[PDB]
mmCIF file of C-alpha atoms and ligand atoms in Angstrom:
data_model
loop_
_atom_site.group_PDB
_atom_site.id
_atom_site.type_symbol
_atom_site.label_atom_id
_atom_site.label_comp_id
_atom_site.label_asym_id
_atom_site.label_seq_id
_atom_site.Cartn_x
_atom_site.Cartn_y
_atom_site.Cartn_z
ATOM 1 C CA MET A 1 140.663 58.531 96.769
ATOM 2 C CA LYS A 2 137.397 57.205 97.954
ATOM 3 C CA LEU A 3 135.195 60.275 97.237
ATOM 4 C CA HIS A 4 134.385 60.737 100.960
ATOM 5 C CA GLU A 5 138.081 60.943 101.636
ATOM 6 C CA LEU A 6 139.194 63.301 98.901
ATOM 7 C CA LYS A 7 142.487 65.063 99.647
ATOM 8 C CA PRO A 8 143.726 67.904 97.343
ATOM 9 C CA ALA A 9 147.383 68.064 96.490
ATOM 10 C CA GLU A 10 149.636 69.383 99.159
ATOM 11 C CA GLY A 11 150.285 73.043 98.762
ATOM 12 C CA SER A 12 147.804 73.547 96.028
ATOM 13 C CA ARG A 13 144.779 75.581 97.116
ATOM 14 C CA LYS A 14 144.678 78.222 99.861
ATOM 15 C CA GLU A 15 141.615 80.155 101.168
ATOM 16 C CA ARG A 16 140.905 83.431 99.356
ATOM 17 C CA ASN A 17 141.284 86.661 101.337
ATOM 18 C CA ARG A 18 138.052 88.240 102.493
ATOM 19 C CA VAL A 19 138.547 91.891 103.234
ATOM 20 C CA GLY A 20 136.078 93.984 105.142
ATOM 21 C CA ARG A 21 134.727 91.225 107.368
ATOM 22 C CA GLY A 22 135.778 92.274 110.819
ATOM 23 C CA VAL A 23 138.840 93.863 112.437
ATOM 24 C CA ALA A 24 140.736 90.993 114.032
ATOM 25 C CA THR A 25 141.021 89.732 110.495
ATOM 26 C CA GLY A 26 143.330 92.670 109.914
ATOM 27 C CA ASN A 27 141.250 94.273 107.168
ATOM 28 C CA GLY A 28 138.309 96.742 108.115
ATOM 29 C CA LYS A 29 139.310 100.126 106.564
ATOM 30 C CA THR A 30 139.854 97.279 104.138
ATOM 31 C CA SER A 31 142.872 98.991 102.624
ATOM 32 C CA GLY A 32 144.303 102.503 102.141
ATOM 33 C CA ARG A 33 143.095 105.469 104.268
ATOM 34 C CA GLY A 34 141.608 108.887 103.379
ATOM 35 C CA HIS A 35 143.090 109.109 99.872
ATOM 36 C CA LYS A 36 141.996 107.649 96.467
ATOM 37 C CA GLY A 37 141.286 104.453 98.313
ATOM 38 C CA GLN A 38 137.857 105.714 97.230
ATOM 39 C CA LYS A 39 135.774 103.158 94.991
ATOM 40 C CA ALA A 40 136.422 104.622 91.565
ATOM 41 C CA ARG A 41 140.056 104.409 92.683
ATOM 42 C CA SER A 42 141.715 105.386 89.383
ATOM 43 C CA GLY A 43 145.442 105.726 89.895
ATOM 44 C CA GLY A 44 145.588 106.941 86.301
ATOM 45 C CA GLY A 45 146.802 103.785 84.543
ATOM 46 C CA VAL A 46 150.595 104.534 84.693
ATOM 47 C CA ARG A 47 151.486 108.251 85.260
ATOM 48 C CA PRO A 48 152.594 111.137 87.621
ATOM 49 C CA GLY A 49 152.067 114.713 86.345
ATOM 50 C CA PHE A 50 155.098 114.640 84.007
ATOM 51 C CA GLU A 51 154.618 111.859 81.332
ATOM 52 C CA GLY A 52 157.951 109.974 81.220
ATOM 53 C CA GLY A 53 156.455 107.029 79.401
ATOM 54 C CA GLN A 54 157.253 109.366 76.536
ATOM 55 C CA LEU A 55 160.615 110.670 75.204
ATOM 56 C CA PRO A 56 161.216 110.297 71.446
ATOM 57 C CA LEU A 57 160.544 107.675 68.834
ATOM 58 C CA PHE A 58 162.324 105.430 66.351
ATOM 59 C CA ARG A 59 160.506 102.953 64.015
ATOM 60 C CA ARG A 60 159.621 101.163 60.705
ATOM 61 C CA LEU A 61 158.803 97.545 59.488
ATOM 62 C CA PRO A 62 158.644 95.561 56.149
ATOM 63 C CA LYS A 63 157.899 91.902 55.274
ATOM 64 C CA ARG A 64 160.613 89.299 56.194
ATOM 65 C CA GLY A 65 161.766 86.626 58.699
ATOM 66 C CA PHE A 66 162.841 82.936 58.678
ATOM 67 C CA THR A 67 162.821 79.866 60.969
ATOM 68 C CA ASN A 68 166.026 78.714 62.733
ATOM 69 C CA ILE A 69 167.384 75.114 62.768
ATOM 70 C CA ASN A 70 170.854 74.931 64.392
ATOM 71 C CA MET B 1 151.848 74.449 166.265
ATOM 72 C CA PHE B 2 152.116 75.801 162.769
ATOM 73 C CA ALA B 3 154.926 76.288 160.285
ATOM 74 C CA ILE B 4 155.954 78.458 157.372
ATOM 75 C CA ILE B 5 157.194 76.712 154.167
ATOM 76 C CA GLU B 6 158.646 78.212 150.888
ATOM 77 C CA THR B 7 156.838 76.246 148.175
ATOM 78 C CA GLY B 8 155.250 78.162 145.258
ATOM 79 C CA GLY B 9 157.010 81.249 144.127
ATOM 80 C CA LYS B 10 155.805 82.036 147.629
ATOM 81 C CA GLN B 11 155.619 81.162 151.320
ATOM 82 C CA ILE B 12 152.840 79.279 153.064
ATOM 83 C CA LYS B 13 151.586 78.858 156.620
ATOM 84 C CA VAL B 14 150.414 75.421 157.519
ATOM 85 C CA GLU B 15 148.939 73.916 160.651
ATOM 86 C CA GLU B 16 148.114 70.350 159.464
ATOM 87 C CA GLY B 17 144.802 68.612 158.854
ATOM 88 C CA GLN B 18 144.591 71.669 156.689
ATOM 89 C CA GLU B 19 144.022 71.443 152.974
ATOM 90 C CA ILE B 20 146.457 73.626 151.083
ATOM 91 C CA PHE B 21 146.585 74.855 147.534
ATOM 92 C CA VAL B 22 149.974 75.322 145.929
ATOM 93 C CA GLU B 23 151.558 75.528 142.442
ATOM 94 C CA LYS B 24 151.396 72.420 140.324
ATOM 95 C CA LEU B 25 153.671 70.153 142.086
ATOM 96 C CA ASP B 26 154.764 67.688 139.359
ATOM 97 C CA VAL B 27 154.035 64.635 141.547
ATOM 98 C CA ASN B 28 151.348 61.954 141.604
ATOM 99 C CA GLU B 29 147.748 62.142 142.691
ATOM 100 C CA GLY B 30 148.048 59.978 145.805
ATOM 101 C CA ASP B 31 151.699 60.185 146.794
ATOM 102 C CA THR B 32 152.758 62.102 149.913
ATOM 103 C CA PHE B 33 154.969 65.140 149.307
ATOM 104 C CA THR B 34 157.483 66.388 151.802
ATOM 105 C CA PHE B 35 158.228 70.112 151.745
ATOM 106 C CA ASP B 36 161.982 70.800 152.082
ATOM 107 C CA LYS B 37 162.082 74.584 152.672
ATOM 108 C CA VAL B 38 160.695 75.409 156.136
ATOM 109 C CA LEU B 39 161.328 78.938 157.425
ATOM 110 C CA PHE B 40 159.909 79.052 160.898
ATOM 111 C CA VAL B 41 157.876 76.849 163.174
ATOM 112 C CA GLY B 42 155.425 78.200 165.792
ATOM 113 C CA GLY B 43 153.670 76.691 168.798
ATOM 114 C CA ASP B 44 154.701 76.047 172.406
ATOM 115 C CA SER B 45 158.324 75.527 171.287
ATOM 116 C CA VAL B 46 159.500 77.704 168.375
ATOM 117 C CA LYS B 47 162.344 77.261 165.905
ATOM 118 C CA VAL B 48 163.130 80.349 163.791
ATOM 119 C CA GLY B 49 165.451 79.452 160.936
ATOM 120 C CA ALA B 50 167.975 81.477 158.972
ATOM 121 C CA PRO B 51 166.908 80.640 155.653
ATOM 122 C CA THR B 52 165.684 77.051 156.565
ATOM 123 C CA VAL B 53 165.095 75.770 160.092
ATOM 124 C CA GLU B 54 167.601 72.874 159.631
ATOM 125 C CA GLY B 55 166.063 69.402 159.429
ATOM 126 C CA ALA B 56 162.271 69.717 159.811
ATOM 127 C CA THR B 57 160.080 68.356 157.010
ATOM 128 C CA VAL B 58 156.449 69.393 156.770
ATOM 129 C CA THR B 59 154.574 66.386 155.177
ATOM 130 C CA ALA B 60 151.362 66.409 153.135
ATOM 131 C CA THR B 61 149.420 64.095 150.896
ATOM 132 C CA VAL B 62 148.484 64.967 147.364
ATOM 133 C CA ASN B 63 144.735 65.255 146.849
ATOM 134 C CA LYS B 64 144.052 66.862 143.501
ATOM 135 C CA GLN B 65 146.149 68.056 140.620
ATOM 136 C CA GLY B 66 143.737 70.583 139.184
ATOM 137 C CA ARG B 67 142.996 73.681 137.137
ATOM 138 C CA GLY B 68 141.269 76.710 138.522
ATOM 139 C CA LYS B 69 138.290 78.611 137.206
ATOM 140 C CA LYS B 70 138.788 80.032 133.800
ATOM 141 C CA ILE B 71 139.318 83.745 133.748
ATOM 142 C CA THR B 72 139.202 85.548 130.390
ATOM 143 C CA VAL B 73 141.918 88.057 129.799
ATOM 144 C CA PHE B 74 140.265 90.705 127.640
ATOM 145 C CA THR B 75 141.898 93.933 126.650
ATOM 146 C CA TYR B 76 141.530 96.857 124.334
ATOM 147 C CA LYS B 77 142.946 100.133 123.122
ATOM 148 C CA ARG B 78 140.078 102.491 122.784
ATOM 149 C CA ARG B 79 139.440 104.075 119.462
ATOM 150 C CA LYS B 80 142.706 102.817 117.910
ATOM 151 C CA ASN B 81 141.271 99.549 116.540
ATOM 152 C CA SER B 82 142.615 96.681 118.624
ATOM 153 C CA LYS B 83 141.231 94.240 121.322
ATOM 154 C CA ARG B 84 142.702 90.871 122.375
ATOM 155 C CA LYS B 85 141.022 88.013 124.300
ATOM 156 C CA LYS B 86 142.648 84.921 125.878
ATOM 157 C CA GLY B 87 141.131 82.441 128.356
ATOM 158 C CA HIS B 88 143.267 81.223 131.258
ATOM 159 C CA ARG B 89 143.020 78.507 133.858
ATOM 160 C CA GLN B 90 145.927 78.021 136.210
ATOM 161 C CA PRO B 91 147.080 74.567 137.186
ATOM 162 C CA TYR B 92 147.398 73.677 140.852
ATOM 163 C CA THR B 93 147.807 70.989 143.505
ATOM 164 C CA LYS B 94 145.677 70.559 146.570
ATOM 165 C CA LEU B 95 147.479 68.738 149.299
ATOM 166 C CA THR B 96 146.509 68.183 152.904
ATOM 167 C CA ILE B 97 149.077 68.361 155.732
ATOM 168 C CA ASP B 98 150.102 65.657 158.207
ATOM 169 C CA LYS B 99 152.850 65.767 160.844
ATOM 170 C CA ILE B 100 154.732 69.072 160.432
ATOM 171 C CA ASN B 101 158.348 68.432 161.629
ATOM 172 C CA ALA B 102 157.507 64.713 161.713
HETATM 173 MG MG1 MG C 1 156.068 108.782 72.451
HETATM 174 MN MN1 MN C 2 143.169 83.160 105.530
HETATM 175 MN MN1 MN C 3 146.215 96.119 111.032
HETATM 176 MN MN1 MN C 4 137.106 106.724 106.810
HETATM 177 MN MN1 MN C 5 146.208 106.724 100.649
HETATM 178 MN MN1 MN C 6 139.656 100.570 97.839
HETATM 179 MN MN1 MN C 7 131.429 105.048 92.182
HETATM 180 MN MN1 MN C 8 146.352 109.009 81.397
HETATM 181 MN MN1 MN C 9 157.244 70.664 135.873
#
């Protein structure tokens, strides 16, 4: 390490992807096609049209809890 | 008095004192090559081989071991988004003939 011969650790650091800069790059549509690959882009957050992130519920909580030494 | 020699992937017609240009020959830049595959020899007397007129070496001297003009291989599919460019320069050998069948 001589400041004009800096060398970053092997396998750390890798150039970021730059989409939308050309075609040979492999990214000029950028990504998607035709759909909601529009800018707003909202998928919805986690959903389809039938809500299965909900079926029924079971719950309660009071004060308690210790700390384990084996 | 000329002669036809197999030598590249191809055959060649050589009269001697005649610079020739064949596929990179994998020999030195001053050494004299001797072509082994001679098909036919013309002139006043004429041997016409089966494959190979038996015996009969054409001899030449190596002059350059070179690479030809670059030619860029560019290609594209219209509309459907995809070109491809590659430069190419073929290696060769320029020899010059001396004493065919001698
Ligand atoms: Mg629920
Ligand atoms: Mn990259
Ligand atoms: Mn692509
Ligand atoms: Mn479009
Ligand atoms: Mn889509
Ligand atoms: Mn997008
Ligand atoms: Mn917007
Ligand atoms: Mn929602
Ligand atoms: Mn070779």
